Design a protein around this ligand. Structure first.
Ligand SMILES: Cc1ncc(C[n+]2csc(CCOP(=O)(O)OP(=O)(O)O)c2C)c(N)n1
Ligand SMILES: Cc1ncc(C[n+]2csc(CCOP(=O)(O)OP(=O)(O)O)c2C)c(N)n1
Ligand SMILES: [Mg+2]
Ligand SMILES: [Mg+2]
Lengths: 552, 552
């Protein structure tokens, strides 16, 4: 005899998940009861929105499946921003949402009468309602297989209250559904491996660029090895920075490719799990030349050649491909040409840009954001997770993050949803409570999730939230003031409030920083203290980050 | 020459809307620019979720259309809880959401690549994308006509960025689309009027019960007149309480009908815009007898007779029906029998229950919630808007609210989404900044929206937020402890944090109350001060509200 909720927890244990995020409710309580009996950890939040974002950050920093538990009705709809974000970011998250009882379908009853499946269908890989309790293990397994294979993404399983409370025979609870233990991701074949390596061997100025899919499959070690065997410079979007950072061949974020002379532009570019899109400057060719030979490895054929021509596309798992390529490159009969001059030209370009951005900063009476994000980048411990939110804030941080020794940099995806950072950081912290998690966020974004300071305190999750306070919704203010004029700024000033005060009232440690020389020492004491912390930094609004310009 | 955004503001002015709620973004800025040129007021919030809830509260307290402005991507998905809530509550809200530019469709670009129409379709009356700028006035008008007619409900208009920035000839901007000025809602015919009045004239123990649709059409005055002409006792769900409260025939919330002897139960019940559902105890018959003659006036035929048999259903606008009935009842040839004994039996039943609930309270060292909600009900000024959130909190308040002289009581609908109250109150306040708005909310619910204290301060919206702090997600804790035992409570204690401290840091006035004798005086000084205020009340967790029992 086992309840539906017991069947959920048992199947999740078999998938090696040991934490889920949610807010309790009567519709979903049989899962909470089962979890208590099996010592399965559920971390509560102050908004289901951040239970979802926590599931994402846990998945992104933990390189694993995240799980969010949502009660019926508003517990589901509050998570929809997180589902959409996981959808565009290709993040493997299983959302388990309870529903109204089928036995009282269409009775205008509590938290019921909304088609949660239909709401989530456009932003999930699969969304499905379980209508009988005996299906639960089989259907959960199917959901887990879909979310954790490429392109990874979110799955919603909607479970009616009276399916969760129904019971099944122990033999039905027993037995194993395929979760992924026996599953092998697609590789590259030997002919493809030989052709890709041969193109790489013929290039004058090649470059590798990694994206989220390589990170999700733990292909960092194999891609770094392949770059090191072949001497190929390694770049990445923000989601794969942690995967390339350790390599002496890492040059950081691919935005640093901007600005080479026309005769020095890369002639060959091999993409591992990176789509054409916002991070590549679309198909404009200013990072990845349109006339380069582009080789694209991705899990979805719709992405191949999407915005610019490719010489070769391969549909398959970028991590598995990096491993096959690394093995064949080690025994490559001709060996690999010396690429040290090309590597050095790239080092100059990327170091030159950092030195210029820092030197060109015009400082006023407040902390310059470049100073603040340099201080933070140069202070975090090796192995830290850095999470970024706000807009001017993350554009500034993007100029220095490539130098930080991060295990993972968790920044905005295409959804670019101001406000996701606090719940993202909280979940990343839960993937390893001993690993530092530093959230760099703006004063606008942080106001979405102030209540989660209480969640961090009660769960023992010692995130350090650094607020860059420019008293404004900053990038949107900039758009009006720079395009249309100072008289055209409207609905963007935020000249009120103390975020450190808010964090203090919620039990977190808190400090204001007005002088740049206090910032790094305060961040160090925050990391040493083992406690959730808010550091409010009073930064200047006027400076325009370089990535804002190249978009202008 | 007019932009799309100008076309939006002009059409909204013609619909007599003068406030909208949103967070600025570059995709939606042409509306913000137009609004600045025309002195159209946009109130900014700290979460689009509360821009939506503010649009709802503005609509519910203002008896008008609410408007929420959402930027592309996450600005849209953060509002989905508000759309769902407006859908189940039948609240007329127009959500205008910007989208990615059509000219860069499918380029993996900023805040784009999500089908916002498809997400909202299951929770709106209409959801549609405007693909050419010249359609905007005509399509906005159509959306406004749908949202403001019965059953009222939310509408989503999705506008691509490059449609909002495109321009149209002034003559196209000029010209009038049908907004509702020339529209007449359906009445009852004379034969229906005569039959309904005749059934009412033959009953021994009749009762009227009003719901949201009567309130939305401003049928309160006509329904009160009809009850007064005929001597019919008037009850209502929480959304129509403000509409019946002024009448000497008002007996308050229909939950007060529980408990009559079998020989005294109502034999005839006329519903005005009230569905069978959570508020009627479904079709259980414990408020509306299954063997009563039920007459149901509602705007949607799916609601007629949904859970219990009806003697007569009429599909039409409950407010317009109340007016036709009132006029015919005034000239009713036979006159109306004396119903004073039945009225008095109802007074005893409703007053008796209040006296019993108050007397049976077992007080410990903390404030009893019944004491707190009685103190608040007996203190608010005549004409106040009271908003309710949290769960134990609103169940307790439901025992005393029928006595308060409220203009409107804005409580949970079927979605029962803990957390909606702060943004709801903020929008209700904006419908008339001189009218008191008191939010009674639990410590759990209030943590969704702490950042909106800053929104109230910057907009000049002096909501008084009263937090009943029992250190817990309270009703869910109760469910575990009362059904399963104290050892089965899990993920529900909230023993951390000072909500008054949070409100103070965000610029609001704030006070803690631990002794019941400080509560009413503190509430009075809060209302007299004209400033946003948080009053944190330390209440006991143990007491079980009566409406929790009748559900148990
Ligand atoms: C959910 C959501 N709402 C609105 C926007 C529009 N937007 C883009 S940048 C920005 C300003 C954010 O300000 P802040 O968090 O303080 O960061 P800053 O630019 O000031 O560093 C806004 C509102 C968005 N991208 N996402
Ligand atoms: C959005 C949402 N999440 C979760 C729930 C489940 N739920 C019902 S009552 C309750 C407790 C709310 O506690 P609080 O706001 O402090 O009010 P109290 O009962 O303590 O007065 C919860 C979490 C819900 N109804 N809606
Ligand atoms: Mg800012
Ligand atoms: Mg509570």
């Amino acid at each position: 005899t086992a309840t539906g909720g017991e069947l959920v927890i048992r199947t999740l244990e078999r998938a090696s998940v040991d934490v889920a995020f949610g807010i309790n409710g009567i519709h979903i309580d049989s899962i909470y009861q089962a979890a208590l009996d099996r010592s399965f950890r559920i971390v509560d939040t102050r908004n289901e929105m951040n239970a979802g974002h926590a599931a994402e950050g846990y998945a992104r920093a933990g390189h694993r499946l995240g799980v969010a538990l949502l009660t019926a009705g508003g517990g589901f709809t509050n998570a929809v921003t997180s589902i959409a974000n996981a959808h565009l970011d290709r993040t493997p998250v299983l959302y388990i949402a309870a529903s109204g009882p089928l036995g009282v379908d269409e009775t205008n009853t509590l938290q019921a009468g909304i088609d949660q499946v239909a709401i989530a269908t456009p932003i999930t890989k699969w969304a499905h309602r379980v209508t009988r309790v005996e299906l639960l293990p089989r259907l959960i397994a199917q959901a887990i297989r879909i979310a954790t294979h490429g392109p990874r993404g979110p799955v919603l399983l909607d479970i009616p209250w009276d399916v969760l409370t129904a019971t099944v025979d122990d033999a039905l609870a027993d037995g194993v559904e395929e979760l992924g233990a026996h599953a092998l991701t697609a590789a590259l074949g030997a002919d493809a491996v030989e052709r890709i390596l041969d193109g790489l061997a013929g290039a004058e100025r090649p470059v590798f660029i990694a994206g989220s899919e390589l990170t999700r499959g733990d292909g960092g070690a194999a891609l770094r090895r392949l770059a090191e065997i072949t001497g190929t410079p390694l770049f990445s979007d923000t989601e794969a920075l942690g995967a390339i950072r350790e390599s002496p061949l890492s040059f950081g974020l691919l935005q640093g490719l901007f600005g080479l002379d026309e005769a020095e532009r890369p002639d060959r570019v091999v993409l591992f799990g990176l789509r054409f899109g916002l991070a590549t400057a679309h198909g404009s060719g200013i990072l990845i030349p349109r006339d380069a030979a582009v080789v694209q490895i991705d899990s979805d054929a719709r992405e191949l050649g999407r915005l610019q021509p490719i010489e070769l596309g391969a549909v398959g798992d970028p991590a598995a491909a990096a491993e096959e390529l690394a093995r064949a490159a080690l025994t490559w009969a001709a060996g690999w040409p010396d690429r040290s001059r090309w590597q050095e030209r790239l080092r100059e370009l990327v170091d030159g840009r950092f030195e210029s951005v820092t030197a060109q900063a015009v400082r006023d009476d407040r902390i310059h954001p470049m100073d603040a994000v340099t201080a933070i980048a140069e202070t975090v411990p090796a192995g830290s997770v850095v999470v970024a939110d706000g807009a001017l804030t993350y554009l500034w941080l993007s100029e220095t993050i490539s130098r930080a020794p991060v295990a993972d940099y968790l920044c905005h995806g295409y959804l670019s949803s101001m406000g996701v950072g606090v719940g993202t950081a909280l979940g990343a912290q839960a993937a390893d409570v001993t690993r530092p998690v530093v959230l760099v966020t703006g004063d606008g974004a942080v106001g979405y999730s102030l209540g989660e300071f209480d969640s961090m305190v009660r769960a023992g999750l010692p995130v350090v939230v650094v607020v860059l306070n420019n008293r404004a919704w900053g990038a949107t203010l900039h758009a009006q003031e720079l395009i249309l004029g100072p008289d055209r700024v409207v609905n963007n000033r935020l000249e009120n409030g103390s975020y450190s005060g808010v964090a203090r009232a919620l039990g977190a440690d808190s400090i204001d920083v007005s002088d740049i020389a206090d910032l790094a020492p305060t961040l160090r004491e925050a990391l040493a203290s083992g406690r959730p912390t808010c550091i409010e930094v009073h930064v200047s609004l006027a400076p325009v980050p370089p990535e804002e310009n190249v978009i202008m």
